[PDB]
């Protein structure tokens, strides 16, 4: 290589290289003294700037500070705000400012470094392929998609944004039309485009059309590393832990969960019943696009290991007897919920995002003919008054053929080869 | 975005808070 020092840098580049090299050296405290000396006798010089930048970035690793960090990111601006800053250098500066927001979270702050990045640059494809992961990050798939037909409609090809369009026509049920987006996309081996959420939204679109090449994508996606199995296809994992499609209480050992569960089903299922009579709207639709037809609700008590007050008011007996076990209310990785399925209702083949949770389910009221669950290749019933478990990282199915309604209690537990240091860090799901 | 909470609609599922 880049070109980083304009006229006046390139008379002062001895120094400006003197105090690089002590931060490539990792003499940390010594190279912010020495860009913090360039910087005041050359305060216009964007070399040192983006050196006092880089030193504030690498300080921040080491003291583990956002503060520190929030401190880089405004240098990285102002070395944009110089006289005379080389190009390379100002593409250099903006996108570290966008990456290191985006590792604070600073989701909207990133995506207006973005968009000066590609009024700066309007020919770089890749900015505004960027742009667009900034929208996708704050949850504006509608941006997002202009963004990558404005990027398609001058390079058909770039397969980054093929895949990233495929990603966004799936998520909004647009089911055949982003099947060659993410196919040609992961075909093209563009950098970006080996990522396993794009096999596991190919297969899955694949799968919902009947085009049996599906699990073509779900072997290559294990071969790269991307999925466990290719019938265990989370992506947030912690490598090793035991996996199996089905579990019985021993096997988990949450048998005073279970026992619980299973003397006091009657309490869960009438308090459930008397939301379905008289608070029904506490039973709120699925809502990821998970069923083929029909009708499935679920009513949350704990998600992301934290209680709904006003839910737990609907059912407050329920909600003290599993205050008393954490492994299932302290579950920052899983939810604790009610769910309803009516006849006529399938929902599709699916996994859920995480190997670090098992599901378990209490039936309360089972119709005696209808109603199945499938994980993996084993398909079983529920029975009123008893747990089944499942890891939901695999692969599972559900259908309701019934002549009336059918009520689940699921409840998620920490899967239990975690360690409680494991669980108090992992990052909730 | 809302959250991954039975599958892997959503383009992350977990938040960033840095350090
Ligand atoms: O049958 C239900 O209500 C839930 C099925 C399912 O997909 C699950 O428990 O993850
Ligand atoms: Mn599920």
Redesign the interface.
Known sequence: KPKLLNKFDKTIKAELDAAEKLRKRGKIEEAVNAFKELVRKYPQSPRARYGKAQCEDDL?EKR???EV?RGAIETYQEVASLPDVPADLLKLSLKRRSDRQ????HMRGSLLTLQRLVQLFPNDTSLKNDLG?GY????DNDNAKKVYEEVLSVTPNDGFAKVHYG?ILK?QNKIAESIPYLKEGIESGDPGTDDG?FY??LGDAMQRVGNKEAYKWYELGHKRGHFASVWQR???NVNGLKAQPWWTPKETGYTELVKSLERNWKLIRDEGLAVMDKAKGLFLP?????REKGDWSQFTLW??GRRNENACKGAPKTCTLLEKFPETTGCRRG?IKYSIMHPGTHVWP?????NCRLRMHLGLVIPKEGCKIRCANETKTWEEGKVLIFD?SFEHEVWQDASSFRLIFIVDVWHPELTPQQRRSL??? | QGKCKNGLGEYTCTSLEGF
């Open positions: 921040a583990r500070s956002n960090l985006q590792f604070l979270g992961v996708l990050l704050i949850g990603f998520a959420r596991f939204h989370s992506l947030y699925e809502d990821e696009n998970l998600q992301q939810q699916h996994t859920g995002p995480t939901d990052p909730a799901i």
